[PDB]
Amino acid sequence: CCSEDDCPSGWKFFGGSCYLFDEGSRGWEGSKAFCESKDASLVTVECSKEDDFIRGILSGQTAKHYYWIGARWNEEHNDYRWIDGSPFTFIGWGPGKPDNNKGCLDYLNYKEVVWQWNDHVDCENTNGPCICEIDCS
Amino acid sequence: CCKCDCQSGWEWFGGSCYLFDETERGWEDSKTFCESQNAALVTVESSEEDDFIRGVISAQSAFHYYWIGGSWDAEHSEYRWIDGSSISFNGWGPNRPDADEGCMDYLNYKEIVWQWNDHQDCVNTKGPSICETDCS
Numbered sequence: 416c417c418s419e420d421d422c423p424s425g426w427k428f429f430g431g432s433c434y435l436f437d438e439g440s441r442g443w444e445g446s447k448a449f450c451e452s453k454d455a456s457l458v459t460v461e462c463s464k465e466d467d468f469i470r471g472i473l474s475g476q477t478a479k480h481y482y483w484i485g486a487r488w489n490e491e492h493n494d495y496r497w498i499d500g501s502p503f504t505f506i507g508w509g510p511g512k513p514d515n516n517k518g519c520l521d522y523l524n525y526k527e528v529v530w531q532w533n534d535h536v537d538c539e540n541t542n543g544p545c546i547c548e549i550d551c552s
Numbered sequence: 553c554c555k556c557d558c559q560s561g562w563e564w565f566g567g568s569c570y571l572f573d574e575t576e577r578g579w580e581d582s583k584t585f586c587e588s589q590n591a592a593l594v595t596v597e598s599s600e601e602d603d604f605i606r607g608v609i610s611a612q613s614a615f616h617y618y619w620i621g622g623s624w625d626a627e628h629s630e631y632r633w634i635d636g637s638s639i640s641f642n643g644w645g646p647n648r649p650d651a652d653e654g655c656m657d658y659l660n661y662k663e664i665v666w667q668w669n670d671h672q673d674c675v676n677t678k679g680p681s682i683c684e685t686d687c688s
């Protein structure tokens with residue numbers, strides 16, 4: 416658990432985590448490496464307050480309609496879970512999701528999905544911004 | 553539970569806050585103590601949870617058993633978690649449960665290396681316990 420103290424310049428504090436809402440243009444796999452290069456991870460969302468926090472930030476802008484997060488299809492377990500291997504606790508799928516395409520998760524704002532989780536089939540060459548997290552664990 | 557929402561002395565794991573309380577109580581009084589903490593005795597739905605628990609209790613050597621939130625359900629004629637839910641994950645030690653109308657504990661003794669056992673004295677056998685809240 417971080418304090419506000421531990422958030423590097425330009426990172427937002429919430430719920431004992433530091434978040435970077437990065438506006439670059441990367442694939443999911445490129446976003447994963449980018450977060451690592453900042454000694455961080457693509458964000459993992461363990462509870463509804465963290466989901467509400469994220470939606471608050473993403474609803475503050477309209478340039479972008481998806482941000483990559485630290486979840487994808489796991490071949491070992493044949494399910495969607497976090498990139499650290501942790502199964503989902505909080506479930507954030509938007510209406511009608513997932514599409515079950517064995518892909519990578521973002522927060523999506525498109526038609527009936529109103530800043531909620533979606534799975535995209537292309538984890539390499541679909542470019543977007545991302546959310547990194549430092550949770551000091 | 554959010555990862556940083558566990559009150560003081562509690563540990564977060566897989567959406568739950570746990571308390572490993574070492575005051576020794578019989579199974580019923582342990583149930584009551586978890587209720588007083590606005591929680592319940594722990595229910596173990598997965599191998600992941602079981603391993604988290606084993607990692608904590610195999611770390612200490614004072615206690616050989618901890619009370620958890622499983623007991624005989626007459627209605628159903630089987631051990632159930634105290635919320636009424638079915639025991640899906642198989643965390644029993646070799647040849648357990650060996651009798652009905654018991655309560656469950658983690659047991660470190662002979663062939664049971666911190667797995668589930670059934671005890672048939674749910675009042676007067678005192679031990680530590682493990683509480684769980686999902687903060688709902």
Ligand SMILES: CC(=O)N[C@@H]1[C@@H](O)[C@H](O)[C@@H](CO)O[C@H]1O
Binds near residue numbers: 514521528533
């Ligand atoms: C990269 C991304 O999330 N793209 C999403 C796609 O997966 C989804 O099928 C569609 C409809 O929900 O919204 C897209 O345009």
Ligand SMILES: CC(=O)N[C@@H]1[C@@H](O)[C@H](O)[C@@H](CO)O[C@H]1O
Binds near residue numbers: 617661664671
């Ligand atoms: C309190 C407790 O769990 N005691 C256990 C008992 O239920 C079990 O039959 C025996 C054999 O495993 O080890 C005991 O002493």
Ligand SMILES: [Ca+2]
Binds near residue numbers: 432459548550555
């Ligand atoms: Ca998180």
Ligand SMILES: [Ca+2]
Binds near residue numbers: 516533536
């Ligand atoms: Ca999709």
Ligand SMILES: [Ca+2]
Binds near residue numbers: 568594595596
């Ligand atoms: Ca549990």
Ligand SMILES: [Ca+2]
Binds near residue numbers: 671
């Ligand atoms: Ca027994």
